[PDB]
């Protein structure tokens, strides 16, 4: 019997915006000893998972899915690296990024720095303040955006400009939003595991419709566990270990 | 008895164009240190680029490592200086600058654009019309395109027209980008950290002509300048100094 346990990271394996607690490391160690395969699926880049989970994340987890699985590792080896260009084509990319640049130039937010548009493997990250800002400026913009809805207004303008582009808009991050082809949500990673496991369990804190765990949670191929915190994840994994 | 410093540009000085340090250059720098020279690098790009070009042991290879023109400075792998653009320009000017850059990038008609157009570094802003997130092929294609269509040079003209009072220098240093930084924060900036510690300072670089990102340091009166065309000429010129 082969059972895969897939975890969202922020809010599932960690307190919000902090690092993996000892209780989480303990339960993952104990799940692997029982013979569970374990994997992470985040919407961020790998560097962000190293920051939340630690430098040895490739040893802790059998599977590390970065960018929703568009960048995939098994036992620290790259098994997949998607590219957006083959899905959208150059003309649509260039029109999209030119409209995003114009919209970011029209903002009246108090702080802007750099790295507004990050072209990753199979997604574009749009960050209104720019990813090159300080921690203090990042935390400030998070609060600003709850009052002024900067990301939500930009998404609405991009939806209005590009109705038939085949893009999903996902406010995943603290100060940014993700743009990727329809179907390249976190359920994307299931193409690498669907044929290799009897059961796949998914654990995540953002499993409501609109949350970046909804598609993987509701995929017919997985057993979903909605968790409110890492304490719920530990309780749920402990139940599965019992068997 | 004299203290001598040898300062090297990196791309086209320590490396073949756009490629990494050859073992031969590694050898000549070792031989210069053995002969009693202090050696340093002065790059216009970030530190991570220098590590790609020179290797993970760059801080052991060179006594001084000057990245972003010396706005980020290391001596024996210890940070001695990190400049901050915000204290020079203030937030209002940075925000107006980057919004005008974004507008201008949005109005381009170039065939390929991807991402990381505007990089806010320690003491400079890097503007890349195609975006730093493009492939090697796309980067090499844009270098040729820009030689014909002068995209960077026309963006610089628009930014200069928009911001006559901002006290900025515009430097076409890279393969696909240009740098923007306060006047006086060119590669000559690094000389403040060394000018009082050396009897003689030599500079080797390939872009020592007016409009080149090595021009101001090459022509500084504190400098003995050595215009080189390739890393082969750098080996030759350092060999001459070792031989006396
Ligand atoms: Mg989460
Ligand atoms: Mg050069």
Q: Which residues contact A165 (CB under 8 A, 6 or more apart)?
A: A88, A92, A96
Measure CA A184 to chain center: 11
Q: Which residues contact A31 (CB under 8 A, 6 or more apart)?
A: A5, A38, A237, A240, A241
CB contact under 8 A, A116 and B131: no
What gap in Å lies between CA A59 and CA A62, rounded to an integer?
7
Using an 8 Å Cβ cutoff, are A43 and A212 in contact?
Answer: yes
- Short-list A18, A197, A11, A164, CA closest to A96: A164
β partners of residue A167:
A181
Largest CA distance in chain B: 59
Using an 8 Å Cβ cutoff, are A109 and A150 in contact?
Answer: yes
β partners of residue A201:
A5, A223
What gap in Å lies between CA A7 and CA A10, rounded to an integer?
9
Burial of A4 (0-12, 13-18, 19+ CB in 10 A): buried
When scoring B85, B86, B91, B102 by the number of chain A Cβ atoms within 10 A, the one with the most, hence best to mutate, is: B102
Within 8 A of A124 by CB-CB distance, chain B residues are: 115
β partners of residue A202:
A6, A224
What gap in Å lies between CA A98 and CA B102, rounded to an integer?
9
Strands B4-8 and B38-42 turn out to be parallel
Strands A71-74 and A63-66 turn out to be antiparallel
In whole angstroms, how far apart are CA A160 and each of A74, B94, B230? Answer: 39, 30, 52
Q: Does B11 show up as a binding residue in the annotation? A: yes
Tokens of B68: 């972003």
Around Cβ A152, how many Cβ atoms within 10 Å?
12
What gap in Å lies between CA A235 and CA A203, rounded to an integer?
11
DSSP annotation of A187: G
Rounded to a whole number of angstroms, the distance between the first and last alpha carbons of chain A is 12
Give me the DSSP letters along B36-51: T-EEEEE-SS-HHHHH
What gap in Å lies between CA B73 and CA B65, rounded to an integer?
6
What gap in Å lies between CA A104 and CA B174, rounded to an integer?
25
- Short-list A183, A5, A162, CA closest to A170: A183
Stated as kind and residue range, the H or E segment containing A89 is none
Q: What are residue A57's phi and psi, to 5 degrees?
A: -55, -35
Is B199 designated active site? no
Strands A223-226 and A199-204 turn out to be parallel
What gap in Å lies between CA A201 and CA A101, rounded to an integer?
40
CB contact under 8 A, B118 and A119: no
CB contact under 8 A, B113 and A98: yes
The closest CB to that of B95, out of A111, A115, A118, belongs to A111
Around Cβ B222, how many Cβ atoms within 10 Å?
13
**Ligand positioned closest to the Cα atom of B45:** 2
CA B85 to ligand 2 centroid distance, Å? 23
- Short-list B68, B217, B97, B73, CA closest to B167: B97
Q: Does B206 show up as a binding residue in the annotation? A: yes
Tokens of B46: 């970030």
Determine the 3-state secondary structure of A4 from DSSP.
strand
CA B92 to ligand 1 centroid distance, Å? 35
Q: What are residue A74's phi and psi, to 5 degrees?
A: -125, 120
CA distance A70 to chain B (A): 16
Q: Which residues contact A210 (CB under 8 A, 6 or more apart)?
A: none
Around Cβ A172, how many Cβ atoms within 10 Å?
18
Count Cβ–Cβ pairs < 8 Å, chain A vs chain B.
82
Angle CA A16–A22–A23, to nearest 5:
85
What's chain B's Rg over C-alpha atoms?
A: 18
Using an 8 Å Cβ cutoff, are A118 and A125 in contact?
Answer: yes
β partners of residue A3:
A199
Q: Which residues contact A100 (CB under 8 A, 6 or more apart)?
A: A116, A117, A124, A126, A154, A158
DSSP strand E in B106-217: where?
Answer: 118-120, 125-127, 168-171, 178-182, 200-205
What gap in Å lies between CA A100 and CA A169, rounded to an integer?
13
Please check whether residue A98 touches B, CB under 8 A. Answer: yes
Using an 8 Å Cβ cutoff, are A121 and B134 in contact?
Answer: no
CB contact under 8 A, B106 and A99: yes
Using an 8 Å Cβ cutoff, are A39 and A61 in contact?
Answer: yes
Rounded to a whole number of angstroms, the distance between the first and last alpha carbons of chain B is 13
CB contact under 8 A, A132 and B119: yes
Around Cβ A143, how many Cβ atoms within 10 Å?
9
Q: Hunting for tokens 């903002």 — which residue is that?
A: A107
β partners of residue B5:
B38, B201
What gap in Å lies between CA A32 and CA A12, rounded to an integer?
18
**Ligand positioned closest to the Cα atom of B9:** 2
């Amino acid at each position: 019997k082969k059972v895969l346990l897939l975890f969202d990271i922020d809010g599932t394996l960690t307190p919000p915006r902090l690092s993996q607690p000892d209780e989480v490391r303990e339960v993952i160690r104990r799940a692997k000893s029982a013979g569970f395969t374990v994997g992470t699926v985040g919407g961020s880049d790998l560097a962000k998972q190293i920051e939340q989970l630690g430098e040895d994340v490739f040893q802790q987890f059998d599977y590390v899915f970065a960018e929703n699985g568009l960048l995939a590792y098994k036992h620290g080896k790259e098994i997949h690296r998607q590219n957006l260009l083959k899905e959208l084509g150059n003309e649509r990319i260039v029109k999209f990024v030119r409209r995003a640049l114009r919209l970011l130039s029209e903002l009246d937010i108090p702080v802007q720095r750099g790295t507004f548009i990050e072209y990753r493997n199979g997604m574009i990250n749009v960050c209104p303040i720019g990813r090159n800002c300080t921690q203090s400026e990042r935390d400030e913009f998070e609060v600003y955006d709850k009052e002024h809805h900067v990301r939500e207004k930009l998404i609405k303008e991009l939806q209005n400009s590009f109705p038939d582009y085949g893009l999903k808009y996902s406010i995943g991050g603290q100060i940014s939003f993700d743009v990727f082809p329809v179907g390249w949500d976190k359920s994307y990673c299931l193409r690498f595991v669907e044929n290799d496991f009897d059961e796949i369990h998914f654990f995540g804190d953002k499993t409501h419709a609109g949350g970046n765990d909804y598609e993987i949670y509701t995929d017919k191929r997985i057993i979903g566990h909605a968790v409110k915190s890492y304490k719920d994840t530990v309780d749920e994994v402990n139940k599965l270990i019992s068997s």
